[PDB]
Ligand binder design. Structure first.
Ligand SMILES: [Ca+2]
Ligand SMILES: [Ca+2]
Ligand SMILES: [Ca+2]
Ligand SMILES: [Ca+2]
Length: 215
């Protein structure tokens, strides 16, 4: 008897982290010089991630993957002819997908500023973080809404790429507004999730700005 032998590409497999439980993950494939019928299996502490169809070598996902928790792992794979069992290690490489949104770190979202604060001043700073890799983890910030809404007020504040909010026009307690509420959003630059290009956005956050009158 000649022992069966896994094909060369059985050393590793790449799988997306969003693969649903129940889906085909990959095929275990081996060859046997005697042309024996071959049966397939998987074992070890990480084998529970999969379910092998022993007759065919089809591998189905049996427990959810997550790049954020276990980005690679090893399993023992097995092929058996009628006479001998042959076992090797396979590396499972999990691919990141865009399954997290930016999350704002800040506890507090209020400040008070003097009405004569010069244009260009930094007024507040926010930070949002996204766990994903690459563009799926790059955060962009936006001012979604300003209250009161004018004409003036839409151009009054600007948020920069590092999360600093700047004063972009002049204030007046008496003649424009004693306050502003800024609705902010953070979004990633997108990536694949559930088989489609996906952009994730935070929950909205609200910054309360009190304007102090100065005579
Ligand atoms: Ca054989
Ligand atoms: Ca994940
Ligand atoms: Ca991810
Ligand atoms: Ca993301």
């Amino acid at each position: 008897n000649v022992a069966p032998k896994f094909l060369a590409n059985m050393t590793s497999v790449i799988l997306p982290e969003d693969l649903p439980v129940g889906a085909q993950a990959f095929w275990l494939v081996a060859e046997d010089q005697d042309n024996d019928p071959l049966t397939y299996g998987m074992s070890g502490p990480n084998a529970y991630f999969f379910a092998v169809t022993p007759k065919t070598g089809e591998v189905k996902l049996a427990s959810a993957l997550d790049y954020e928790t276990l980005y690679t792992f090893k399993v023992t794979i097995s092929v058996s002819d009628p006479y001998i069992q042959v076992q090797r290690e396979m590396l499972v490489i999990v691919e990141d997908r865009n399954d997290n949104a930016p999350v704002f770190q800040n506890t507090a979202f209020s400040t008070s500023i003097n009405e004569t604060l010069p244009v260009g001043s930094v007024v507040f700073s926010v930070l949002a973080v996204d766990k994903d890799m690459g563009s799926a983890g790059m955060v962009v910030y936006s001012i979604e809404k300003v209250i009161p809404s004018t004409g003036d007020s839409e151009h009054l504040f600007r948020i920069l790429a590092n999360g600093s909010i700047v004063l972009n026009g002049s204030l007046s307690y008496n003649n424009k507004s004693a306050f502003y509420q800024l609705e902010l959003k953070a979004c990633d630059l997108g990536g694949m999730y559930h088989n489609t290009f996906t952009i994730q956005c935070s929950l909205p956050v609200f910054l309360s700005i009190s304007v102090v009158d100065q005579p």
